[PDB]
């Protein structure tokens, strides 16, 4: 959703739908990290698997901008 | 003088496949046109019941697994809703002439074998083995799970010389236990018939039927099958021209449970006669080769180094010869 009040961050399993070599877009973690202007390590911080095991949620803006740049949602 | 490279043995006591039919009690003497029971399908909802690997023990993951159960379809077999008696019929064939191997290399080896088994025949007949075989036919061991919790089970045994009946029997298979070997006049008469067959003194062909009183529309248990992959079906049964059936090797394994001479204990009861006599139900081997009581060491101690063991161990070795298999290197 575009409304910030109802949005929740995705989990790792949902996030593997678009990032990773097995995903449907077929884009790497390194290329997606370069698409957001981050390091590879800080991007790997997002896809650890559980927030207790050193994992952070992604932001609203980074998530929607990443969906924009991959050609999934238009996100005007 | 050593053991041969190859050694093959055919099997005596060849059974048929046993198929099932259903009908009413007290009409069991008219049971020649009873319709067969059939295999259908139904769908079952699986649920989570296994142990967990201490990583799948978050409550959220557990409830998320509870939310989406998997579905399966599964074969089943029941009695009809009005009949209450299960009829199982098969055919046993006793061969005789059990000493000779069907394949061999060293002639002196098989000659030593032949005189060993001839001396065993001369000392004792087959009366102990035939008595125990007729015991395993008296109670219905071949009714594997269908015997469990049955109301009353009766069995007719019928001798076939030409195309007609020679002599019959009948029993109450619940009166005969599963544990011990008793004595009975009809039973030893049948055992004498089997012993006459096993000595090669005339061929014996038997057909056995068995009736089990269970209940209306209850579940019966045919033999199962093997599934390598699925994408759908997860359990299949065995059938011959659309009639539920039991494998022949299941009947043969239910017939050879006569071994009461394993060194471990006696409270367990008789087991089947195997080299390194084992049970898959317990995952454990009696007659370990560390003890000097498995089949192979007993065999080449009787033949090559000429130690006749105890007489019941000679019964065990002769039963392993009757079952037959692949020996050698």
């Amino acid at each position: 959703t575009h409304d910030a009040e109802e949005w929740r961050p995705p989990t790792s399993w949902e996030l593997r739908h678009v990032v990773g070599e097995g995903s449907f877009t077929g884009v790497s973690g390194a290329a997606a990290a370069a698409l957001l202007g981050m390091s590879a390590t800080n991007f790997r911080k997002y896809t650890a698997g559980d927030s207790a095991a050193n994992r952070q949620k992604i932001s609203f803006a980074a998530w929607h901008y990443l969906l924009d740049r991959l050609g999934v949602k238009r996100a005007s | 003088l050593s053991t041969a490279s190859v050694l093959a043995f055919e099997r005596k006591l060849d059974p048929s496949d046993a198929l099932m039919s259903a009908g009413a009690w007290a009409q069991r003497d008219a049971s020649q046109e009873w319709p067969a029971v059939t295999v259908r399908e139904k769908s079952v909802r699986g649920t989570i019941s296994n142990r967990l690997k201490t990583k799948d023990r978050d409550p959220a993951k557990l409830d998320a697994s509870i939310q989406s159960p998997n579905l399966q379809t599964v074969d089943v077999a029941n009695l009809p809703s009005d009949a209450d008696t299960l009829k199982v019929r098969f055919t046993l064939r006793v061969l005789g002439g059990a000493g000779t191997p069907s394949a061999c290399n060293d002639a002196a080896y098989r000659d030593k074998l032949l005189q060993t088994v001839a001396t065993y025949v001369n000392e004792q007949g087959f009366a102990e083995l035939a008595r125990r075989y007729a015991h395993n036919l008296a109670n219905a061991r071949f009714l594997w799970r269908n015997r469990v919790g049955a109301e009353a089970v009766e069995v007719r045994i019928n001798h076939i010389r030409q195309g007609e009946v020679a002599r019959t029997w009948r029993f109450d298979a619940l009166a005969i236990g599963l544990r011990d070997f008793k004595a009975d006049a009809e039973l030893d008469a049948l055992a004498e018939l089997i012993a006459s067959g096993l000595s090669g003194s005339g061929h014996v062909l038997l057909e056995v039927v068995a009736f089990a009183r269970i209940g209306d529309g209850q579940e019966v248990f045919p033999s199962q099958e093997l599934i390598l992959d699925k994408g759908q079906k997860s359990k299949t049964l065995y059938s011959v021209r659309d009639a539920a059936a039991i494998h022949s090797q299941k009947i043969g394994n239910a017939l050879r449970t006569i071994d009461t001479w394993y060194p471990d204990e006696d409270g367990l009861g008789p087991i089947a006669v195997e080299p390194y006599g084992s049970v898959t139900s317990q995952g454990k081997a009696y007659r370990q080769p560390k003890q000097k009581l498995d089949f192979y060491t007993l065999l080449d101690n009787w033949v090559l180094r000429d130690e006749a063991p105890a007489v019941e161990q000679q019964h065990y070795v002769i039963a392993n010869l009757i079952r037959g298999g692949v020996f050698g290197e």
């Binding site: 593997r16 097995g22 995903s23 | 998320a64 697994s65 989406s68 998997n70 992959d229």
Partner: protein
């Protein structure tokens, strides 16, 4: 050891068996909490072989998901 292909996971079944004299193992292909296929594969298989054992089912699922959720067309 599991294998992860995107949102899919392929796990073995923790105790093998002997089929035709050779040791084997059961494998399961998951899509989240939903189990999709089960095969029985022998050992001495590298992970690439276990991958392209299931690659066709993956591709068919992709084809169906692409056709079902296609967007609307104006003209």
């Amino acid at each position: 050891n599991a294998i992860h292909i995107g949102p899919f996971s392929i796990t073995p079944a923790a105790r093998g068996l002997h089929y035709g004299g050779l040791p084997h193992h059961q494998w399961t292909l998951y899509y989240g909490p939903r189990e999709m296929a089960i095969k029985t594969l022998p050992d001495s298989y590298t992970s690439s072989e276990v991958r392209d054992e299931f690659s066709d089912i993956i591709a068919e699922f992709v084809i169906d998901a692409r056709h079902r959720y296609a967007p609307d067309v104006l003209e």
